[PDB]
Every structure is written in C-alpha cells, then in structure tokens.
Amino acid sequence: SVDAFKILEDPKWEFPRKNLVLGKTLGEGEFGKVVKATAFHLKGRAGYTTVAVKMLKENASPSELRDLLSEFNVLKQVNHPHVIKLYGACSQDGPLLLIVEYAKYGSLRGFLRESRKVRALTMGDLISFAWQISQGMQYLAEMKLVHRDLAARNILVAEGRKMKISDFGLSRDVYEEDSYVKRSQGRIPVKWMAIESLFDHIYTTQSDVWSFGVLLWEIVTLGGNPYPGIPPERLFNLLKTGHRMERPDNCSEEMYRLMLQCWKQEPDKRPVFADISKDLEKMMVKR
Ligand SMILES: CC(=O)N1CCN([C@H]2C[C@H](n3cc(-c4ccc(Cl)c(N)c4)c4c(N)ncnc43)C2)CC1
Ligand SMILES: [Cl-]
Numbered sequence: 001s002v003d004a005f006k007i008l009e010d011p012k013w014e015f016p017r018k019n020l021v022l023g024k025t026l027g028e029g030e031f032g033k034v035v036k037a038t039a040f041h042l043k044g045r046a047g048y049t050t051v052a053v054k055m056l057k058e059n060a061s062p063s064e065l066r067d068l069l070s071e072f073n074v075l076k077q078v079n080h081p082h083v084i085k086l087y088g089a090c091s092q093d094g095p096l097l098l099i100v101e102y103a104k105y106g107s108l109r110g111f112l113r114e115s116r117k118v119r120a121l122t123m124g125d126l127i128s129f130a131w132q133i134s135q136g137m138q139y140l141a142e143m144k145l146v147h148r149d150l151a152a153r154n155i156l157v158a159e160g161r162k163m164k165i166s167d168f169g170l171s172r173d174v175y176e177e178d179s180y181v182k183r184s185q186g187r188i189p190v191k192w193m194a195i196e197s198l199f200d201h202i203y204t205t206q207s208d209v210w211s212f213g214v215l216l217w218e219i220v221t222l223g224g225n226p227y228p229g230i231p232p233e234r235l236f237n238l239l240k241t242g243h244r245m246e247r248p249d250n251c252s253e254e255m256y257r258l259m260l261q262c263w264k265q266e267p268d269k270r271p272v273f274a275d276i277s278k279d280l281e282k283m284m285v286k287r
Pocket of ligand 2: 027029032034167
C-alpha cells in the first residue's frame with residue numbers, strides 16, 4: 001500500500017538532525033552520497049564525534065532508496081569491530097541520513113591504489129587485511145547472512161589501517177524471511193559473481209567465499225582489476241571450461257592456493273571463513 005518513500009521511525013536509532021553538522025563529500029557512488037560530519041552528544045556521552053553520513057543523491061531513483069533502507073536494517077542488526085558501525089540515523093521529517101562510523105583512510109581499493117605510487121605497505125600488511133576481513137565475514141556468516149557484493153571497493157579502512165566491511169545494501173539472508181521478496185536482479189559485478197550465481201542466480205555464503213577469493217586477488221595486486229580485458233560471456237565460458245586467474249605477480253604460493261580453494265566448482269567444497277581466518281593467521285606467524 002503505502003508508497004516505499006514513507007519510512008518507519010526507529011526510536012533507538014533516530015538522531016536529531018539539529019545536532020549534526022555535515023561537511024566535505026567523501027564520495028558519491030551508485031549507492032549514494034557519503035559526506036564527512038561530526039555529531040554532538042552521540043550515544044549518550046558527551047561531546048562531539050566525527051562520523052560519516054550516507055544519503056540519497058539529488059537524482060535518486062526509488063531503487064536507490066529501497067537499497068539504502070535495505071542497508072539501514074542490516075546495519076542495525078550487526079555490530080562487529082571489522083564491520084562499519086552504525087551510530088544513528090535521521091529518517092522522519094527530513095532527508096534520510098545514516099550516521100555511520102568514520103573510516104578516514106577510505107575505500108580499501110583506494111587505499112591499495114594510492115600506496116603503490118607513493119605509504120609503504122609490506123606483504124605482512126596485506127595478509128593482516130585479509131585476516132581482518134575474514135573475521136568480519138566470519139561474523140556475518142554466524143549471523144547466517146549473505147553479503148553478496150564483497151569487493152575491495154566496498155571494504156573500508158579506518159584509523160590505524162583497520163578494515164571495516166561496508167555497503168550492506170545488496171545483502172540477503174541465506175535462509176529467506178519475507179514471504180514475498182522483490183529480487184534485485186543482476187546487480188553484482190560479473191567478475192565477483194560465483195559460477196553458481198552466474199548459472200542459477202544462487203548467492204550463498206559459500207558464494208561470498210568465491211567473492212572473498214577475488215577480493216584476495218585485489219589486495220595482493222594492490223587495487224588490481226580482476227580478469228583484465230575479458231568480456232562477460234568469455235568469463236562465463238572461462239569459468240565453465242575450468243580456467244581461473246593465474247598466480248599474481250609477487251604473490252605467495254600458499255596464498256594463491258587459498259584463492260583457488262575459493263574458486264572451486266562445487267561450493268560445498270570451499271573453505272569457510274572460520275577455517276579461513278586460521279589459514280591467514282598461520283601465514284603471518286611464520287614471519
Ligand atoms: C564509485 C566507487 O566505487 N566509490 C568507492 C567507495 N566510495 C565510498 C565513499 C567512502 N566512504 C563511505 C563511507 C560509508 C559510510 C556509511 C555507509 Cl552506510 C557506507 N556504506 C559507507 C565512509 C566512511 N564511513 N568513512 C570514510 N569514507 C567513507 C567510500 C564511493 C565511491
Ligand atoms: Cl559507498
């Protein structure tokens with residue numbers, strides 16, 4: 001009935017728009033506009049706190065609001081150190097604003113791309129990043145939740161070079177809830193899509209392991225674009241015929257072995273994030 005525009009008000013998460021000073025735009029993707037801000041008297045006590053506010057673009061489409069609200073409810077449920085922390089919101093009688101943790105160093109891909117022309121990033125730094133994101137995904141899988149997109153773009157980096165999983169707009173439950181859900185078709189970048197997602201549109205938690213395998217590639221390549229040059233059809237055939245991405249330039253032999261474990265044909269035989277987090281710690285403790 002009620003048009004999707006009208007949003008419900010959650011009492012715990014509603015923050016006064018009067019107690020918020022917006023500022024410099026941090027980015028404006030298809031997800032929406034995110035600006036830097038600081039909020040006074042946030043979560044009880046007592047001073048101001050520098051945050052980041054996502055919002056609708058000036059030319060927002062209904063699906064953008066539908067996904068921004070689908071991003072809201074997922075952020076409400078989850079609370080984890082390596083998952084960007086939702087601090088508040090501004091829904092009623094005004095533009096919808098999501099007050100979220102401020103991860104200064106920016107998108108992980110932007111963090112990796114900036115460093116290779118310039119800060120110095122050791123190899124031990126990269127395995128720590130994947131180990132951080134493995135724990136965060138481990139937490140989300142313990143919530144029995146699929147994140148779907150998972151890429152070096154959607155991962156954030158906070159103060160002290162700490163990872164924060166973000167962009168929960170496309171998330172879905174591994175076991176469905178709504179009796180009638182409108183499925184958001186073909187929104188995931190084909191290169192990060194698991195073979196089954198390409199084949200049968202199935203986005204499981206083991207599919208996010210496939211996504212994590214591509215993410216590992218992005219990290220070690222420092223922002224590299226996966227499967228270069230290949231069009232969409234040629235990629236589907238490549239994965240169907242059996243080929244994957246080859247061992248990247250200056251990547252560990254046991255690290256590349258893990259990447260192929262995530263691109264296994266059968267999702268049933270794919271390592272789980274809890275058993276992946278142990279594989280990444282074993283890599284650092286040697287060094
Ligand atoms: C086109 C494209 O591929 N781009 C790459 C990603 N860019 C994002 C803006 C920047 N960003 C975002 C957030 C943020 C805050 C709340 C939420 Cl709910 C979400 N999802 C994210 C954020 C932050 N808390 N602190 C610092 N920077 C931040 C990364 C946009 C452009
Ligand atoms: Cl974003």
